[PDB]
Design a protein around this ligand. Sequence first.
Ligand SMILES: [Mn+2]
Ligand SMILES: [Mn+2]
Ligand SMILES: [Mn+2]
Ligand SMILES: [Mn+2]
Ligand SMILES: [Mn+2]
Ligand SMILES: [Mn+2]
Ligand SMILES: [Mn+2]
Ligand SMILES: [Mn+2]
Lengths: 284, 283
Amino acid sequence: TYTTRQIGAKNTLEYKVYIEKDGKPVSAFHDIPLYADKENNIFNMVVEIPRWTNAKLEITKEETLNPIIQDTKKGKLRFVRNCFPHHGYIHNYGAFPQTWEDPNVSHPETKAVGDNDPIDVLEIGETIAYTGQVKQVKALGIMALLDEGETDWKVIAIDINDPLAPKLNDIEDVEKYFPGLLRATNEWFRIYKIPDGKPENQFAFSGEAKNKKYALDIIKETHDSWKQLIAGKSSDSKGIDLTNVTLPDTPTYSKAASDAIPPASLKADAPIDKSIDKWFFISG
Amino acid sequence: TYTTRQIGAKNTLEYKVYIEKDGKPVSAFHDIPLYADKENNIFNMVVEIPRWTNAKLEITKEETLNPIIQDTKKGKLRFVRNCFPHHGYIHNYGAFPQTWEDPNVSHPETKAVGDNDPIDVLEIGETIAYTGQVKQVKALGIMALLDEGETDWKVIAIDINDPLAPKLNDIEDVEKYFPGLLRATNEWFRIYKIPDGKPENQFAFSGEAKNKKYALDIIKETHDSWKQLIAGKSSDSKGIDLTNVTLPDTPTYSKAASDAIPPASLKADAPIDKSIDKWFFIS
Ligand SMILES: [Mn+2]
Ligand SMILES: [Mn+2]
Ligand SMILES: [Mn+2]
Ligand SMILES: [Mn+2]
Ligand SMILES: [Mn+2]
Ligand SMILES: [Mn+2]
Ligand SMILES: [Mn+2]
Ligand SMILES: [Mn+2]
């Protein structure tokens, strides 16, 4: 069973969420299996950001066991801004564990290096998720975002427990049951950092949402990149903390790391500056 | 000064928000002046529903001093559903006090009776408001919603404290600085109750947002309707509680009504059923 261990108050620099397996912290990057059911194409998603929120929570690469923390810019807590007509993130947003967008090779599909993280996942179901949740999802397709000039694929997925899951099998089904969502997704990822002063992003394939099989192929490639990474065989692991508690044949296996995590110290959410309310009316 | 007096927990049947003047409850419908600055047409808006929320909070006609209370449906609380691409309400939503959409006469602009309520206000500024807030706003324009067959005007306004307030002076400025907001507003009020089984709504004037001059005239008419109402001179006040604490020449003036309200009993927000998360795709 997977649960969460929260340290501190949400919306603070001290906030951390660790994932626990049967009560013991494990690495959110390395120790949660990619596959919940490999041959039925059912994946474990680690949720970072609930739909319609702003705090830019991420699995952190550089802390032991890779807890989810809030990203920062210029020493400050990062919040993604509201871009009309969207409120925060328009998906439950997270990642697949045991994957890596390899920054050390140019990816041919996109002609750009990877962004150095777990492959990203957009979960489209009705219920709002929680940070650190491990949920089981089916892949429906994938979009090739070039985010600040780096390969940053976005998998389109649904929770297998969603009432609609049985009716969603491939990417065309997304348009059928969620009409306009894929177009809004393309817009969101193009424009969301314009309020921060960044350029508009771009997609490969003129923004096409590639199908389920394409998605599976890219997921599997990023899983192979991770296999090399966790074996200690990347040419440059970028300072990622490869400590894990479930992979005893890897060089960075450590039983002790789980017990060194402090106990939960969950505090009430901290306030968020009112500026985060603002609705930006921007576009590329 | 205006403040709030909260009874109970948000998102419960017991929840009430009274508006206080100098610490004493007043009627949110009758006792807050329509104008904050009459010469400059600066209005007092009573906020009911913060942007990006679902709970259908309203000034209630049926309780003394007209506190803000959540609408109910089939013994439970009423929430407006999320309709893609929108999250709950896309405005800070409320009303102007001392106004009435008269239900006893058909309105010629829209050829329908009024919806029996204060005139409604959409406040488009950056900051999310709070329930029971009295904010001061400039009027920019107005849309003629026919809501389930009834005249249900929606004023478009901006908080005078908004950074953009100086640049927002008439309805065309809304498209200039908030492109797409008026179109989304038309869509929102057309479709928001389709998940509840209602027919789509309609607008007069093909959904045009009329300008400030036009809006001021409609607001004035609804103020005159309220002046008739509060004087006890409507042919049918529809059981509205007309009790007030600041209008001594009205038949329903009663300063003791203020002293009858219980003290604040603010509790933490209650949870909302997870079904309200759902995003409806109503194309
Ligand atoms: Mn990042
Ligand atoms: Mn990511
Ligand atoms: Mn990115
Ligand atoms: Mn990424
Ligand atoms: Mn109503
Ligand atoms: Mn109203
Ligand atoms: Mn209405
Ligand atoms: Mn109304």
